[PDB]
Structure prediction request, 887 residues.
Amino acid sequence: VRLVEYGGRVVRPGGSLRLSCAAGGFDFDDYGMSWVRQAPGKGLEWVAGINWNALDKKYADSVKGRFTISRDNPKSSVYLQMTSLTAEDTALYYCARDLRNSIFATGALGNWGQGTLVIVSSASTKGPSVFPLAPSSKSTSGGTAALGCLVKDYFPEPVTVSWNSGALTSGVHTFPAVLQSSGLYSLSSVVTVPSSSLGTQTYICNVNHKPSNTKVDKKVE
Amino acid sequence: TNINKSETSCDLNATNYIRGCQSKTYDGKIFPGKGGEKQWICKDTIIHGDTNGACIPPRTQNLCVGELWDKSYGGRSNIKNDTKELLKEKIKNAIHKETELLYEYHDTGTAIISKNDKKGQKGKNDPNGLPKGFCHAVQRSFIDYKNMILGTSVNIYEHIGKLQEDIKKIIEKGTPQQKDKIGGVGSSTENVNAWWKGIEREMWDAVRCAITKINKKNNNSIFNGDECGVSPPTGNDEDQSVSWFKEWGEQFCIERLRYEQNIREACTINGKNEKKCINSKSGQGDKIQGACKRKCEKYKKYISEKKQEWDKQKTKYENKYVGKSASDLLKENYPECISANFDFIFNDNIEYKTYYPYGDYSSICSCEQVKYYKYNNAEKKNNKSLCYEKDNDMTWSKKYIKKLENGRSLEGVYVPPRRQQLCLYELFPIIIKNEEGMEKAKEELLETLQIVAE
Amino acid sequence: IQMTQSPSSLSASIGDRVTITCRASQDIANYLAWYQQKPGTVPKLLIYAASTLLSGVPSRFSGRQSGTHFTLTISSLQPEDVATYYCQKYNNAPAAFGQGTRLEIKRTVAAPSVFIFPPSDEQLKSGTASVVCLLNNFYPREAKVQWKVDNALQSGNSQESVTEQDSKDSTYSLSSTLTLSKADYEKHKVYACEVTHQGLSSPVTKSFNRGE
Prediction:
């Protein structure tokens, strides 16, 4: 009825990390537990599973030997020790319970936790760089142009981007983050506006990189 | 939880001309070369009263009193012109001459805790940047300095009673309150040490300042102020008779692993299946011709002296904390003790001494081909290490019940007296031996299992 | 053990019947559960034992099984049922999830409003290239973007990003970001993005010159 995970962190490749999962009104003593990871914008993937008495621990084929699962019933916690992390294990990790008390590790995951990001890279938490995207008389297509700014190289933990302090809402197509070759995230936050309005009012895009505490508020022509 | 505090103050990189010392040399001298080792002086030392308490750590023997007690005046009643806050920065800098001696003593191997098995001191490193031993400086060194401030019956090496009577006179001279004293001797150690423990709410602010300038002034490890956590350590262990016992245990186990590695290098390396040596032959059985001898007889001497120290450290610890065992205190506080059996290595039994000349390493030092001999034909039954007579009156006990990997506990099963004195001593030296060269382990295990059962 | 789930991008409209298949390679006889995940939330278990609807789940869902073919059926698709469905099996060893079927609202065909946003002078000062072609409000999701550097094919130097199906109009937006060095940036004159969309009669070119 209440599962929370701890340990989400940015780790060097090949490092180690220990995730933990608590439990609430849930009687965390005769229910099996599981760990399921979801890479960003991908499908869920079972990772680990542990029995009620921890006599039966099963692992996904990919994460085997590199992953260890354990319980501690008096503390009412379940832990996942992770070692030799690769760049591909970057995922949102959920801890889940069977919805049925039983004697097996694997079962239908009824209650899930909020999950923790386990971003794995060799980056350095470098702040964002804002670049504007000027429109043109060519972009005045159908009485409608577009204005945008792209945030570049803003690892980690993608950023909130608004327009005119959140004044503009219609047409704001802030694209999802993307991990380019350098190991740094990037995105764009274009917005479509009437081409007649071009040059009439002012447009500023506001980026908030919380991990670096960076606040950039760029006016775009 | 609490928080940290200001400041970036104490820019006293060169504090003052401290007359005490620039180096805490209790495990010999700094490289190059060694020598000058301080030792765990045993019980019944007059300079420490009757020494009813535990033995004296060498580091506490050369404890960097700095300029609270000092010299150049014979034995100077040093706090009559010198101060106490130089010790605030010589906790900082006495553990900067000792975190540069962390970095050299502990982090190059001129301390006991300094050297691990073979890789050294940087492959092993706690999250707070420091080679192992500064977590045991806030715990060992800092608590021992606070102990020097408080003091048990074992008065440390300069008649700390003179300094404490001075605290009554020369520190209760309007510190902390005015000359109108508060409380008395009870509430002396907690008025001049409750505005020194109430400012060891601030000396712990000052020791978190110490660690944060171990981060920002001499930067072997850089982070916020957190020495071993921003809080002072738990009570009932800061007792010198306990903290020193823990220090002794950790030191003993580290150097026991050291001697274990050396006898590996003389009986695993340089040695053979029966751990014999060059032309070991009978002779007096298959005894060592010397290559192991001077590599393991040193271990025997070391166990002799450390037993002479531990036998009556343990007795005091038990009688002071009735219901807890010394092995219990030590083993989980230091993960390097997990292979140590203080009962076995310190048996008070002449038959044990004879049959296990080299302690728990007897089976990996002197091997005469352990072999169970059947009912007849020159039975070698008593000629091995022996067993007590079974005690009739023991009580069913629930100690030492295993803890399930469920994290649970059995919580209700009781070990029979017949089982908690089940005799399996023979099995332990064989287990220690057969860490190496498997598929012979089972061969020796069956034999020793037979002799144990018989 | 694999769990082949298909189709992967099933489209439908409100009021339709939606069927999802989760073929299992081995025998799991009925140890299969269905999970629904909306964007940005935790999954929610809808059905377990391959048929037993979990309490609180709307009754419009159903699950049935034929041998090793498991099908989840939404009788009357509702706008709050647009999500991904996962069909995780939990019989014994790897308890692996399915590939994941993503439902989307089916609407009339549209056309992307193509844009050829060029790099900025201070981005040149930074030293890379940030050529961006924008596809806006298009539908269906399938659309191809190509880059012509002086009418020369480009590959391995652009990146793709797509918004999820926008709620108010069920349209998609796509962004193609082309990155080049300064050297090969001024080594060429004209940059063009070619949009190949099912709703376009012909591929549409949007180009510019660096001097423009």
